[PDB]
Short mmCIF file of C-alpha atoms in Angstrom, two decimals:
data_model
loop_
_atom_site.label_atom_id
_atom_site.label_comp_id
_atom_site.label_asym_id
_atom_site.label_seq_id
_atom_site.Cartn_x
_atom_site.Cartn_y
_atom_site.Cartn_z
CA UNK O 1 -0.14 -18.63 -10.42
CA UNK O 2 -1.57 -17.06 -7.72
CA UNK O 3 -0.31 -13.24 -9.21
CA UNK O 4 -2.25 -14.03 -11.77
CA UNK O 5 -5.26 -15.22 -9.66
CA UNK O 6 -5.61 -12.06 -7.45
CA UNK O 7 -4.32 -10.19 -10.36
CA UNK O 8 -8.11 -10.65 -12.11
CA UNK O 9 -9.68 -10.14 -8.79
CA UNK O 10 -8.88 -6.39 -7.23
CA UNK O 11 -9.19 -3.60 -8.92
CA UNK O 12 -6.95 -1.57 -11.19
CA UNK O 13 -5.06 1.37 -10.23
CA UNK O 14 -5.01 -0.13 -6.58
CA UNK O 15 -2.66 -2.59 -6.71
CA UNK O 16 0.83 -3.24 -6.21
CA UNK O 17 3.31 -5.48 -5.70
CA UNK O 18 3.08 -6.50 -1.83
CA UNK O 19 -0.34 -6.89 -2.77
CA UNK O 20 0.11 -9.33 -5.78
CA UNK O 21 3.01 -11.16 -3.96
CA UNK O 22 2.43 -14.16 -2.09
CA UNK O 23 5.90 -15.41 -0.91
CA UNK O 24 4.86 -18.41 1.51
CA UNK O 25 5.05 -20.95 -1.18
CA UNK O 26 8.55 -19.91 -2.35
CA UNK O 27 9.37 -20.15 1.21
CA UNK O 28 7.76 -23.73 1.98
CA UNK O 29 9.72 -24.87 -1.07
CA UNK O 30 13.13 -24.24 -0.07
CA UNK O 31 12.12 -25.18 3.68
CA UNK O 32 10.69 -28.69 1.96
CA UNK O 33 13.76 -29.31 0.14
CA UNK O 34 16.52 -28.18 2.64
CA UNK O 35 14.22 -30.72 5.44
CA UNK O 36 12.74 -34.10 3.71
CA UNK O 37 14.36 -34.75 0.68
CA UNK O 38 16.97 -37.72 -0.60
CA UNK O 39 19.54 -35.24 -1.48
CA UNK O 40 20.06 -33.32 1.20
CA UNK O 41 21.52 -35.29 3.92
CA UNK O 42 22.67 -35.19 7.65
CA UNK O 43 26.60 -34.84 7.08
CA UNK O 44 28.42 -37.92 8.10
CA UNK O 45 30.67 -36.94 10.75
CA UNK O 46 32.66 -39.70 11.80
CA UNK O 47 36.20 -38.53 11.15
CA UNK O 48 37.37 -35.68 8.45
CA UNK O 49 38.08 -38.19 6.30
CA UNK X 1 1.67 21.78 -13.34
CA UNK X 2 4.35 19.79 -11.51
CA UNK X 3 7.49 20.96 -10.33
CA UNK X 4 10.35 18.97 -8.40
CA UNK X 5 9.26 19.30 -4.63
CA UNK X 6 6.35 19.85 -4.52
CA UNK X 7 3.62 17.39 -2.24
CA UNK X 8 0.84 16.45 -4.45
CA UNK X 9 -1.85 13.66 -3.73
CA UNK X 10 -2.18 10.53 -4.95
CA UNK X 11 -5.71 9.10 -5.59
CA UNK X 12 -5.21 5.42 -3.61
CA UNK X 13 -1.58 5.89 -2.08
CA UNK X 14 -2.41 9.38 -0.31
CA UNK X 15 0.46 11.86 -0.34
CA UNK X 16 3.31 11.84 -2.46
CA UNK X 17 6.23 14.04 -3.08
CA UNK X 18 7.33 14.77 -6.34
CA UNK X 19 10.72 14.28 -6.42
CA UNK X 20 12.31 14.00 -9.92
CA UNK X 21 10.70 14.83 -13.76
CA UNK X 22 11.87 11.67 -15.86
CA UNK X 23 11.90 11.74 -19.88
CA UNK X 24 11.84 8.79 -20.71
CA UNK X 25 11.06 7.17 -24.48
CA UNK X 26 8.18 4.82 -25.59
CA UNK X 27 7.65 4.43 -29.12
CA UNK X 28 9.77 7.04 -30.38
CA UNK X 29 8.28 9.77 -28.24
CA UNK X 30 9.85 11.94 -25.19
CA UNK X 31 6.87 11.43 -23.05
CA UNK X 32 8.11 12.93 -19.98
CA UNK X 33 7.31 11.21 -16.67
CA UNK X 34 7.46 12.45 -13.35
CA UNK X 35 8.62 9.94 -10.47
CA UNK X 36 6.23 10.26 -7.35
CA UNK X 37 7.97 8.75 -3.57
CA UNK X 38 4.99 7.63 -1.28
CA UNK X 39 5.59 6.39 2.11
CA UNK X 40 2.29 4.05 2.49
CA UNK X 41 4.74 1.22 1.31
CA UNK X 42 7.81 2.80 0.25
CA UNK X 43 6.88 2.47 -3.51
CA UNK X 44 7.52 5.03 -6.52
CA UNK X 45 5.42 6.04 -8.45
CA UNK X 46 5.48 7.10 -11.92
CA UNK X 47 3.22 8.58 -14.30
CA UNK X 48 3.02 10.63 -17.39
CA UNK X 49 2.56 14.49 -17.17
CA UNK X 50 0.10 13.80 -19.64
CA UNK X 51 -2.56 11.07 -18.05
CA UNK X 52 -2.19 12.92 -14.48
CA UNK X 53 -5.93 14.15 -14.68
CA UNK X 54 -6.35 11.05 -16.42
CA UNK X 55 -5.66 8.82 -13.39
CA UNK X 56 -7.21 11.21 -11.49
CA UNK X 57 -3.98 13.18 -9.33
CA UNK X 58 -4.83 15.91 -7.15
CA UNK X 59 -3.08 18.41 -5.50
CA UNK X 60 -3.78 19.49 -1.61
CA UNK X 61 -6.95 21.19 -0.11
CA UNK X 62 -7.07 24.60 1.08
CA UNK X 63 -9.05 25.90 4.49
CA UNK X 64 -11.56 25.78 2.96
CA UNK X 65 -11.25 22.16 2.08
CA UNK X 66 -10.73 22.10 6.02
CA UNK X 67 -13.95 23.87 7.10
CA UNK X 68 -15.84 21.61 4.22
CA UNK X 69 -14.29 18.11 5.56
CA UNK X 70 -15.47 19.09 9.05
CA UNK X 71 -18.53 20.05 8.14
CA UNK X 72 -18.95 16.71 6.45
CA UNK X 73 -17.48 14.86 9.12
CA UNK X 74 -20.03 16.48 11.69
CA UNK X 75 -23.02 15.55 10.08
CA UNK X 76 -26.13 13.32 11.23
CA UNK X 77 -28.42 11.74 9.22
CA UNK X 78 -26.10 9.18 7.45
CA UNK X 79 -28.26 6.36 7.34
CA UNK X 80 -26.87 3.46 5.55
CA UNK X 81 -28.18 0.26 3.44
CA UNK X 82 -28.22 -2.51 6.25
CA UNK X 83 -26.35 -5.34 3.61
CA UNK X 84 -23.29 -5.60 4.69
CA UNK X 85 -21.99 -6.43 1.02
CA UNK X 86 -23.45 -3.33 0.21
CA UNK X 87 -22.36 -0.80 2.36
CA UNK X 88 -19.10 -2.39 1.99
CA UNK X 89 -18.72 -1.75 -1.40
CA UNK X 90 -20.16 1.88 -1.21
CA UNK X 91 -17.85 3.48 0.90
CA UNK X 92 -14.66 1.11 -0.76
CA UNK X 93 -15.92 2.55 -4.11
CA UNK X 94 -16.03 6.12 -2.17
CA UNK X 95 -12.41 5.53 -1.03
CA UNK X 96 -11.01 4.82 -4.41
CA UNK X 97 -12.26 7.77 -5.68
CA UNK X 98 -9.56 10.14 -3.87
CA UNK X 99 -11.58 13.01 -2.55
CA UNK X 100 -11.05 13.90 1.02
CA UNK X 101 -14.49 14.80 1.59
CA UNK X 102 -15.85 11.50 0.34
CA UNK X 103 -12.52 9.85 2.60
CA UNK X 104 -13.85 11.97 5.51
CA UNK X 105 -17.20 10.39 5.06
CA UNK X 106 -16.14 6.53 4.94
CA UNK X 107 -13.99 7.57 8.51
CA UNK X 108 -17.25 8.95 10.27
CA UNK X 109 -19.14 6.27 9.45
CA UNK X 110 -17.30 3.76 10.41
CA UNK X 111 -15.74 5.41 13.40
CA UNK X 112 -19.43 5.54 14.37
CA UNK X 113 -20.77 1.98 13.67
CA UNK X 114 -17.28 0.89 15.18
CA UNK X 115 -18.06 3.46 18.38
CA UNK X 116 -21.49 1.86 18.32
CA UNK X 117 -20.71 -2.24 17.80
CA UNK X 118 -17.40 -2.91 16.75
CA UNK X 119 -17.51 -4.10 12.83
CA UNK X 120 -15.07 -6.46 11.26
CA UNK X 121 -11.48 -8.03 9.91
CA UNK X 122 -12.44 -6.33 6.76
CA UNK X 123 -14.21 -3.01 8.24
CA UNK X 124 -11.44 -2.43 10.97
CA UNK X 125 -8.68 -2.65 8.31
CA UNK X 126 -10.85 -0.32 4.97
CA UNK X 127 -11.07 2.10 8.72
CA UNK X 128 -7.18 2.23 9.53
CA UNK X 129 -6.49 2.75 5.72
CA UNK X 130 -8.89 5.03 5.12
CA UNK X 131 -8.29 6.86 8.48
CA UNK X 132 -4.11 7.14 7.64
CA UNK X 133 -4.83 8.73 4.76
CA UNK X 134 -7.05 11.33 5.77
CA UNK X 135 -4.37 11.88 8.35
CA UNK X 136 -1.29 11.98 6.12
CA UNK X 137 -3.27 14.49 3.91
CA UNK X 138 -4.42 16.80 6.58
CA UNK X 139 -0.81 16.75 8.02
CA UNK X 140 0.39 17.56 4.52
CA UNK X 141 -2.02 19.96 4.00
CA UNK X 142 -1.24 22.21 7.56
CA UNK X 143 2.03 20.83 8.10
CA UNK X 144 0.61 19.64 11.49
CA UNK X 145 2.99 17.72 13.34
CA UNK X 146 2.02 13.57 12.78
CA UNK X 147 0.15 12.41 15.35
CA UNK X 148 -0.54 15.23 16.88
CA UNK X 149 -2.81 15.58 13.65
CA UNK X 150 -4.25 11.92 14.83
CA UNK X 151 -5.06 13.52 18.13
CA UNK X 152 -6.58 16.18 16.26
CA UNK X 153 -8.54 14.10 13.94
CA UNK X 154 -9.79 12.13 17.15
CA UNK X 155 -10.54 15.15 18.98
CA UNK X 156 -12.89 16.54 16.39
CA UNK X 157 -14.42 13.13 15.75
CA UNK X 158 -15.07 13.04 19.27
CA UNK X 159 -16.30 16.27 19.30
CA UNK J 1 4.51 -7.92 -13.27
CA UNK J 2 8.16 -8.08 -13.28
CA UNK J 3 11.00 -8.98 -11.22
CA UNK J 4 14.32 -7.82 -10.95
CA UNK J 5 17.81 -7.65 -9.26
CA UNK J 6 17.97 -9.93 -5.88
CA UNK J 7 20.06 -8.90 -2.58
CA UNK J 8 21.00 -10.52 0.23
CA UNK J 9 21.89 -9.10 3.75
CA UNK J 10 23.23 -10.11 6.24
CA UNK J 11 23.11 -13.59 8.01
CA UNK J 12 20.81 -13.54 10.92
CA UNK J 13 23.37 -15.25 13.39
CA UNK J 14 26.83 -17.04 13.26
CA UNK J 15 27.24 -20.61 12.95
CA UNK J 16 28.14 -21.41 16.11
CA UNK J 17 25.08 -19.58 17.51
CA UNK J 18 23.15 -21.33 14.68
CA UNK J 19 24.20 -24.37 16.31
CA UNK J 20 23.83 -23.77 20.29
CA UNK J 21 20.63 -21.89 19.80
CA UNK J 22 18.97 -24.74 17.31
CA UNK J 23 18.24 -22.12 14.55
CA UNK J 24 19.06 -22.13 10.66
CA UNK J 25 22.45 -20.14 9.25
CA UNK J 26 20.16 -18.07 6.27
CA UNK J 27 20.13 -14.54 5.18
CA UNK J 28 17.35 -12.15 3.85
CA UNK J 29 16.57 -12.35 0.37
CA UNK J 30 15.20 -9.00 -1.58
CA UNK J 31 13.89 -8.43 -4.96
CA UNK J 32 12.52 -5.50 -7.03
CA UNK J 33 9.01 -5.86 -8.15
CA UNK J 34 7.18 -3.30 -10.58
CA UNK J 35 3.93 -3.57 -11.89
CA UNK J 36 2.94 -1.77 -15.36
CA UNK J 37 -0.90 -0.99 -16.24
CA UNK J 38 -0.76 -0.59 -20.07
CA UNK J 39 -3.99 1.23 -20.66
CA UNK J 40 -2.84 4.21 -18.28
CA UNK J 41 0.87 3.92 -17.90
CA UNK J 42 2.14 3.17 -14.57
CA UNK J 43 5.14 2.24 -12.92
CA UNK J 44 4.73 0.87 -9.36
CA UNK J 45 7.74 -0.37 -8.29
CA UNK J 46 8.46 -1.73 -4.32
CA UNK J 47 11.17 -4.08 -2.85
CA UNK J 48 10.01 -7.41 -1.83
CA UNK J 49 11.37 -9.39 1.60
#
């Protein structure tokens, strides 16, 4: 979505693909799931078992 | 035009070396293309022989070019539209164009104004890309030892 | 604009380390990006962190 967005915006012929790319939501997604979420849990160490 | 080695200049990227002559197919054609390796951002480039002069690809200035730039570069009565929208877009619409005198002009003015005041987030970083350009194409152009080409370019700015 | 082929390097630090040092056990993720203009012909292609 945001490619797109700043894809309309700057001008042709000087753009590329570090300019286009915005990775910081890709980023807060993984670091949102891996932290606050039901399915990924603190591992229950008790025993091995 | 092209051949595999040659340094030839890109109109927004600067310098690039052409490296390798592709032939590659679109619609049934051989339209040959020829792979370009900047350094601004490690990207590579490539275009059709044909649309080179289209897009506007340029190969390196002579002394002449040299003597011309300076010339430019030490010249008063550059006096400016005081919008700020204005002048930005002026010498960003001069800096796409890929001419090194026009690139020579956008780093004297603003290596003046930022001499004088000091501009801007925006100002300071259309100055650093403007200003490693003209350096990579000078240094290209004399094969001028980096940054001893910056010291050169300050030098004669300084004058 | 068009991606292509992901990499990994490298993890940053061991798991112990990951442990003692309260840090995460990850590795770098890369991907080729290339971006066409249509009306020219253009191939800009980078490699994306």
């Amino acid at each position: 979505r945001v490619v797109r967005e700043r894809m309309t915006t700057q001008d042709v012929e000087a753009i590329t693909p570090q300019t286009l790319i915005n990775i910081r939501p890709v980023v807060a997604a993984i670091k949102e799931f891996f932290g606050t979420s039901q399915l990924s849990q603190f591992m229950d160490q008790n025993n091995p078992l | 035009i092209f051949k595999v080695g040659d340094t030839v200049v890109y109109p927004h990227h600067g310098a690039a070396l052409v490296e390798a002559i592709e032939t590659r197919t679109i619609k049934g054609e051989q339209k040959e293309y020829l792979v370009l390796k900047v350094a601004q951002g490690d990207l590579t480039v490539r275009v059709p022989a044909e649309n080179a002069e289209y897009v506007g690809v340029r190969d390196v200035v002579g002394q002449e070019g040299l003597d011309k730039v300076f010339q430019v570069l030490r010249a008063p009565h550059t006096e400016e539209p005081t919008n700020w929208s204005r002048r930005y877009k002026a010498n960003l619409e001069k800096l796409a164009s890929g001419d090194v005198n026009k690139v020579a002009e956008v780093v004297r003015d603003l290596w003046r104004r930022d001499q004088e005041r000091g501009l801007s987030a925006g100002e300071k970083r259309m100055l650093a890309k403007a200003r490693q350009i003209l350096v990579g194409e000078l240094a290209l152009a004399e094969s001028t030892d980096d940054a001893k080409a910056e010291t050169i370019l300050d030098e004669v700015l300084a004058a | 604009l068009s991606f292509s082929d992901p990499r990994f390097d490298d993890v940053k630090a061991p798991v112990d380390e990951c442990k003692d040092k309260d840090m995460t056990y990850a590795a770098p993720l890369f991907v080729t990006a290339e971006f066409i203009n249509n009306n020219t012909g253009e191939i800009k292609s980078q490699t994306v962190f």
